[PDB]
Symmetry: C2
Subunit: 182 residues, 2 copies
């Protein structure tokens, strides 16, 4: 696990913040997910994590893809959104190579939240995907959408259990890599 | 600053979360402040920080005061609240003896955000106080309330710039303790 490289990035930016629900912005939620998961992987496990920093995300695709290629797992955090404010659940978009990783991530979040796993236990393939960062998924990264920002109830749960959810994600990544806590 | 000790805690708990504004809760914002500032002081400045953990707060007073007494500076993060939803500004409650630290913190946040300083450049004394954790300030800790959760505009600013606000706080603490800015 100490030879492994985990890439974590955040979708969207301060100027183009993705989906919004009130004063909650996708860009901000994605920044929190990337930062918290990164910090736990580094602190609790001493693992190598490469990121697009601690600020907002939306690293240029060219640069992102270079990071994807240099890593063992690469995850960009996003929130889902629908006009239907009852739409709910967890999904991760990637190539079939990454199905197991998508399922590990999705299950980690489902256990903590009771949210529904969409797709195949949280996996949706790139060949059928529609996304602003579909190119990231096509390149072998994972576009992870743990919840719909448009779902007020799920968003409230996320906001009240953010650190616990992100710890579940970090712990699941470490477990899959066989990394013990340090 | 390498031999100094900082204490950081958070107000309120998961099931008694303090003031709320929609699905934003004081306990959760306080947890973010405490965790982000602590992580910057530890990871960027290499300083020694004592905390009530990475979860929710409301460490018992007997325990909290042990940390206050064993630190060079001790801050519990809270949010202010009012019936008047346009009430605004920064305050830090502590003993008179501890005025300078309160003003350092408040002015740092004012510079970053443009928020108004309440009291004397952010300081308010423990001897005229009304607060659930007044006893934390009475012991010479600092009950820090950088903004009113009840103010939609200021809460939104916190939400969109929190990592910068928390870095401004961490920088102010480090520099006052003798460390070079990072
Ligand atoms: Zn997105
Ligand atoms: Zn409070």
């Amino acid at each position: 696990a100490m030879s492994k490289i985990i890439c974590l990035t955040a979708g969207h930016s301060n100027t183009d913040p993705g989906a919004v629900n009130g004063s909650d912005r996708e860009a901000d939620l994605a920044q929190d997910m990337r930062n918290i998961v990164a910090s736990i992987l580094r602190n609790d496990y001493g693992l190598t994590v490469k990121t697009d920093g601690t600020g907002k995300g939306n690293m240029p695709l060219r640069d992102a893809v270079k990071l994807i290629r240099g890593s063992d797992v690469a995850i960009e955090f996003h929130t889902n959104a629908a006009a239907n404010k009852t739409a709910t659940g967890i999904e991760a978009l990637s190539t079939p190579k990454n199905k197991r990783w998508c399922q590990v991530l999705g299950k980690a979040v489902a256990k903590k939240t009771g949210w529904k796993l969409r797709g195949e236990d949280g996996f949706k393939p790139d060949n059928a995907g529609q996304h602003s960062r579909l190119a990231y998924a096509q390149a072998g990264g994972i576009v992870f959408e743990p919840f719909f920002i448009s779902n007020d109830t799920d968003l409230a749960l996320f906001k009240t259990t953010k650190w616990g959810i992100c710890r579940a994600i970090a712990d699941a990544i470490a477990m899959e890599l066989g990394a013990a806590k340090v």
